[PDB]
Amino acid sequence: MSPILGYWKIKGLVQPTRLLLEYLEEKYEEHLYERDEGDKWRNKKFELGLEFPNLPYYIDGDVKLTQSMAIIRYIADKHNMLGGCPKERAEISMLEGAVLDIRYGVSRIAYSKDFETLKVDFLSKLPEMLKMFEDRLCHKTYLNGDHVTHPDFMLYDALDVVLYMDPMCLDAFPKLVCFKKRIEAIPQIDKYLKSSKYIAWPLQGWQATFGGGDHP
Amino acid sequence: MSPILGYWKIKGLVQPTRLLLEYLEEKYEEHLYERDEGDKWRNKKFELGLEFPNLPYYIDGDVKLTQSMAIIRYIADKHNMLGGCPKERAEISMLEGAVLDIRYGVSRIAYSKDFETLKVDFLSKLPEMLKMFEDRLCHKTYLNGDHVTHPDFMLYDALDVVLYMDPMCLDAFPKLVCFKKRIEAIPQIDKYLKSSKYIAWPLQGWQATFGGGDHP
Amino acid sequence: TFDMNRVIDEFDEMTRNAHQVQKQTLKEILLKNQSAIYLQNCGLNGNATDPEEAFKSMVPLVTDVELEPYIKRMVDGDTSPILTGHPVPAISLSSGTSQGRPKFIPFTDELMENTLQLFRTAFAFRNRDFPIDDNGKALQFIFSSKQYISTGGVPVGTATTNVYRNPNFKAGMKSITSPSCSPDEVIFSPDVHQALYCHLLSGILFRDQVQYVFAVFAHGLVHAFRTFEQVWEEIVTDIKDGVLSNRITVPSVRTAMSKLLTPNPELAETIRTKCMSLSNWYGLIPALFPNAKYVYGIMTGSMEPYVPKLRHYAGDLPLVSHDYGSSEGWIAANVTPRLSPEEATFAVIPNLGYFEFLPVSETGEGEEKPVGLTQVKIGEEYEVVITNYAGLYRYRLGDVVKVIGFYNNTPQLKFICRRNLILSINIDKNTERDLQLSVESAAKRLSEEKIEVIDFSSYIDVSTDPGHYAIFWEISGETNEDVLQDCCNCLDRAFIDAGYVSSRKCKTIGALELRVVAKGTFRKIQEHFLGLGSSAGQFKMPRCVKPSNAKVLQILCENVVSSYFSTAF
Ligand SMILES: N[C@@H](CCC(=O)N[C@@H](CS)C(=O)NCC(=O)O)C(=O)O
Ligand SMILES: N[C@@H](CCC(=O)N[C@@H](CS)C(=O)NCC(=O)O)C(=O)O
Ligand SMILES: CC/C=C\C[C@H]1C(=O)CC[C@@H]1CC(=O)O
C-alpha cells in the first residue's frame, strides 16, 4: 500500500512530515477530519488495528505508525536522512529538541489561558535560544551542512511560529530568514505551496486562543 | 576523563538515564547542582562551551549532547540499538511518545499552580494510553522485550510517579504490576536502588507545588 | 494637423521618390551627425558631390562592444559624448548583447517626432481598411510610469517612456489617437500592474464606444486576460459595493477609482452571468466591447508561438500588426491592414535613416559586399546595418530578414528571426545558472499566495558607495510587502561566488535592495525590443545590467510596489 497520512485540518506537528515528503519527493495520500469528523473516528479507533489510538496515523505496506517523533524518524532513514553517526542523529534529535521545546512551547497555552501575558515571560527567555542557531549557522548553509534536512522543517514551522506570534521577534538575527528561504528554495515544495494541498493556517488546533479560528 | 552526565538532583528529564547508565555497565561521573546552585546555572553553560544550551547535559569522552529524549536514543545506539529498525524505532518512539505525552503532560502541569485538578484529569486521561500499553503486554514480561531496554524506566518513572500522586491508578492493570515487579527484579537496578546514587524525589524541580517539595 | 489621406499622400509620394529622399536624408544625418571627434577621426568632414559609396567602404561599421565606451562616458558622473551628437536626453539599451554585456544606443528628439509621423501613416492606412469613429477612445496597454536619474545626473529612459513624459505628448496625440482608458496620470502611475487592471476596468466602463484594444505585442495582452480571467470576480465585487479592494495600496490609483466608484449592483450581474457562460476563455475581447475594430500589436518573429493564443483571444476578428520600430529608429510601417498577421509585412519609411545590408549568401555566413535597400534582391535574406540620427552609424544588430515585396519602390519585409543569439564573456557574472537558481529560490514565499514570478533582472550601481545590487521582479498579482523583504534576503545569500558573497556578507557591497516593479514592465521593454529596427527577432534579456544598460535603468527607482533594503544584516 502507498503512504497514507492522517492529521487534523491544521498544519501543526504534521507540517514537518508533509514538507519532508516533498523535499524527498515522496508521494503521499491524505485523510483529514474536517469541522466535526474528529469525533466520528471513535468507532474507528480500535478497528484500525492501530496499537495506540491517535493522530497522525500511518498505514503503509510495511507498518502501523503514529505520533510526530516516530513518523519523522521512520520516513527519513529509509530515504537515508535520519542520521549517520552516534553523534549526529543525536544532534538531530537535540536540534529537534530545540525546535520542539520552543514550538510545543508556543502551544502549551496558545489555545489556552491569556496567551499575551504568557507571551511576555517566554519572549523573555527566547533570545538565547534563537541566538544559538544563528551563530552556529554562519559557515554552513543550514544547521548540519549543504543538503536540506528535516530538523529544518520543524524549524520551518518554527520560524513561522514566533514571527506570527511576534512580528518583530526576528529584528536582530537576519540570517534565519534568508536561510528559511533557502530551504524553501527547493522546487518541489514550492509547487505544493502553489498547489491545492497547501493550507496556510491555523498552525495549531482550530479553537485556539492564539492562532485559532477559521480566518486570521 | 570519565564521561560526564551533568544534571540537578531531580527525577525530571534525567531519571530514565541514571539507572540506565548502569544497564550497559558503562563508566560515568556526576555533577550534582542543587536548588541553591541556581547561581551555577548562569556561570557554567558556555564556559565549557555548549552550542545548544540545556539541562540535562551528558558528555562521553567524545560527545556533546542535551535534551532528555535525545539523550536516551543516544544511550541506546551506544548499545547498538538503532542501525535503524523501523517499526520499533517508530514503535519505541510511539510507545515512548504516548509516555512523552504522559511525561511532558506532567511537566506541563509541573510548573502549574493548581496541580491537583490537572493531575486527576491527567489521571482521568491515563487509562487510555496505559490500556494501549496494557494491550501491548501479556505474551511476554515487559513493554517490548525479555531483558531490559531504555524505554522501560521512563514509563516506569511515569508509572512510578503516577502511583505516588494517586495510590490506585495501577490497580486495574495486573500485567503492568509484574512489569513494575520485573525491573525491580533484575540484579543491577534493585541492587543500585538501595545505593546512594538512587534518586526518588522530587518528580520535577523542587519549585513544583506538587511532585516538587520534599517528602515522597 | 492630421488629414487621413494627406498623411498617406506624404508617404505615397515619398515611396515613389525614395532614392532621392534617402540620399538627402543620408545627407541630413551627415550634415547633422558630424562633429563628434569619432566621426572625423573615422574620416568624415562633410558634404561634397561624394556622399554615399565612398562613405560605406571608408566610414566604419560598429558593434555593441565598441559602442559601449562612449555613452559609458556620458552616463557616468560626467556627460561626455564623443560618438553621437548632442548629449542625449535619455539612453536606450539595445537587444542582443556585447560579448555578454549591455548594449548602447542614444535616443533623440526626432524619434518622438518620427513616432507621431510613422504612426500617423500607420493608422491612416489602417483607417482606409478599418474606418474609425473620431469621438471614441481606445483600450491601450501603454505605460510610462518609471523614471530614473543617471549617475551623471542625466535621465535615462526607454523609447516609449521618453515620448509619453515629453512636454509634446498631448498636443501631438490629441487629434490622431483615441484616448487611453486610463487617465494619463494612471499611465504614469507608480503601479503599472494596478494601472493594468484599472485601465482594463476603465475599458469596461465605456465598452460601447471603444474601437481599439492595444498593446505592442500579443503575449502581453495574453497574460492580461489570464489575469482578467483570474481576477474578474474581483472586478465585479469591487463594482457591486462600489469600493476598491484593500489589495491596492498605491496613492494615485485608489483616489482615481474612488471618484469613479459608484455602487453598481446591476453591471456586476450583467458581466457575471455573461462571463461564466463562455467556454474555456477563448476570445473574450469582442464580447466585452461590442464596437471595437481590432487588436493591435506585433505578431511576427518570436511572436509566432504567441500568435495562436492571441488568435485564441482574437477569434474571428481581423489581426492588425503594429509597425516595426525602435529606440534606434523607426524602420517600417504596416500599410496593408486587410492582410493576416502571418502574411503581414511592414513598409520602410524613406526619410528616417540610411540602411545598408550585410550579405549572408554564398555559405554561412558571408562577407559579401553590401548594397542599398531598394537595390536589394527579392526573395533573399540579408542582415540589416543601420546608420541614423540615434548616433548609430552602420550599427549591426545581428539579424537577417527576407523581402516579401514592394509598396511601389520601397520593400515590405518578413522576419523569420526568433533568435539572433551569439555571445562571449561577461564580467558581471554571476551567470544565469546562479541567477536563475537565485530568483527561483526566493520565489516560493510569494508563491504561498499562489502567485508566481514573471521575470527578473539585476543592476550595477556606481552612483552609490559601493557599487552594488538592485533587483527587478515581475509577478502575476498583488501581494504584501513583508514577504518581499525576506525574499530580498534569500537573494542576498543566493549568489555564491567567493568575491561577491564575501563582500555581500560583510556589506562591502551595500545591503541588497528589493524593489518590486509592477507587472508588464519587462513585458513593455520586450515590446520595445522585438520592434527593434532590423529583423523582428530581438528579445533576449540581459539579466544583470551595468550602469551601462538602459531600458532597465529608468525602471528601477520610482515605480516600486515597495522598495526595501536588505532585511538581512
Ligand atoms: N505527544 C503525542 C501526542 C500529540 C497529539 O496531541 N496528537 C493529536 C494530533 S494533533 C492527537 O492524536 N489527538 C487524538 C485525539 O483526537 O484524541 C505525539 O507527539 O503524537
Ligand atoms: N526540551 C528541553 C527543555 C529542557 C528544559 O527546559 N530543562 C530545564 C531543566 S528541567 C532547564 O535547563 N532550565 C534552565 C534553568 O532552570 O536554569 C530538554 O528536555 O532538554
Ligand atoms: C508611434 C510609436 C510610439 C511608440 C512605440 C510603440 C507603441 O506605442 C506601440 C508599438 C509602437 C512601435 C514599436 O514596437 O516600436
Curated annotation (Swiss-Prot), chains A, B:
GO molecular function annotations of the record: glutathione transferase activity
Alphabetical UniProt keywords? Transferase
Which EC main class describes this enzyme? transferase
Checking Gene3D superfamilies in the record gives: 1.20.1050.130
Q: Name one Pfam family in it.
A: GST_N
Q: Which residues form the GST N-terminal domain?
A: 2-83
Binding, glutathione: 7-8, 41-45, 54-55, 67-68
Q: What does this protein do?
A: Conjugation of reduced glutathione to a wide number of exogenous and endogenous hydrophobic electrophiles.
What protein is this chain from? Glutathione S-transferase class-mu 26 kDa isozyme
Q: Which organism is it from?
A: Schistosoma japonicum (Blood fluke)
What are the top taxonomic ranks of the organism? Eukaryota, Metazoa, Spiralia, Lophotrochozoa, Platyhelminthes
Curated annotation (Swiss-Prot), chain C:
Example GO BP:
response to mycotoxin
Q: What class of enzyme is it?
A: ligase
- Residues annotated as binding an L-alpha-amino acid: 160-164, 524-528
What InterPro entries does the record tag this protein with?
A: GH3 (IPR004993), GH3_C (IPR055378), GH3_M (IPR055377)
Q: How does it assemble?
A: Interacts with GSTU20/FIP1 under continuous far red (cFR) light; this binding increases its activity and determines the priority of substrate binding.
Q: Which family does it belong to?
A: Belongs to the IAA-amido conjugating enzyme family.
Q: What is this protein called?
A: Jasmonoyl--L-amino acid synthetase JAR1
Q: Which organism is it from?
A: Arabidopsis thaliana
The gene it comes from is JAR1
